[PDB]
Amino acid sequence: QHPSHELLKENGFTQHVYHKYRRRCLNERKRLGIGQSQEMNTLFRFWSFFLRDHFNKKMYEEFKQLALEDAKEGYRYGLECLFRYYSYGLEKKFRLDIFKDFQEETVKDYEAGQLYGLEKFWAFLKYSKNLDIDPKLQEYLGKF
RNA sequence: CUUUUCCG
């Protein structure tokens, strides 16, 4: 019943419901601050799954921006969802712009003293179906 | 693969 799940059903997505639901999550985040909104978490989660089956560039962009604004504040759930999306989604259907984003954020995450991104990227290669990997990122995987 | 079930 929660829009975060209902919008994931076979034919459950409508523009009206999503926008109303997207608005509430954003408003709650603004009101209670970053890392303090239960909905926003739902929206992050809704995003990583939904985009895997229904890629929308503009939606992915908002997803990506909000996740990185959260992570730089210390609340990394949104970024984990983005990484989960990158690994799971690109596995499902490969997109070069998205994969290039994947490599970029994975490097930034590892350079930030983190392992979540690197582990998700490694997992992608393992379950993925000739790609040009970043040489600096290739070195990071070697020590993983 | 940490984040649901009606506070309109």
Author numbering: 796 to 924, 927 to 941
Give the text the authors published on this PDB structure.
Recently, we and others identified La-related protein 1 (LARP1) as a novel downstream target of mTORC1 and proposed that it plays an important role in the translation of TOP mRNAs. We have also shown that LARP1 associates with the 5’TOP motif via a LARP1 family-specific ‘DM15 region’ located within its C-terminus. We show that the DM15 region of LARP1 specifically binds the 7-methylguanosine 5’−5’ triphosphate (m7Gppp) moiety and the invariant first cytidine of TOP mRNAs. Biochemical analyses reveal that LARP1 selectively prevents the binding of eIF4E to the m7Gppp cap to block the assembly of the eIF4F complex on TOP mRNAs.
To better understand how LARP1 engages the 5’TOP motif and controls TOP mRNA translation, we determined the 2.6 Å resolution X-ray crystal structure of the DM15 region (DM15) of human LARP1 bound to an RNA oligonucleotide spanning a segment of the 5’TOP motif of ribosomal protein S6 (RPS6) mRNA. We selected nucleotides 4–11 of the 42-nucleotide TOP sequence of RPS6 for co-crystallization experiments (5’-CCUCUUUUCCG-3’; the sequence used in co-crystallization experiments is underlined). Importantly, despite excluding the first three nucleotides of the biological RPS6 TOP sequence, the sequence chosen for crystallization fits the definition of a TOP motif: a short stretch of pyrimidines preceded by a cytidine and succeeded by a guanosine. Co-crystallization of DM15 with part of the RPS6 5’TOP motif yielded a crystal lattice in which one protein molecule interacts with two molecules of RNA in the unit cell. A given protein molecule simultaneously binds nucleotides 1–5 of one RNA molecule and the 3’ guanosine (G8) of the RNA bound to the protein in the neighboring unit cell. G8 sits ‘upstream’ or 5’ to nucleotides 1–5; we denote the 3’ terminal G derived from the RNA strand originating in the neighboring unit cell as G8* to indicate its discontinuity from the polypyrimidine motif in nucleotides 1 to 5. Amino acids R840, R879, and H800 define the path of the RNA by aligning it on the surface of DM15 through ionic and hydrogen bonding interactions with the phosphate backbone. Amino acids Y922, Y883, and F844 stabilize the nucleobases of G8* and C1 through stacking interactions. Sequence-specific recognition of G8* through its Watson-Crick face is accomplished by hydrogen bonds with E886 and S882. Arginines 847 and 879 specifically recognize C1.
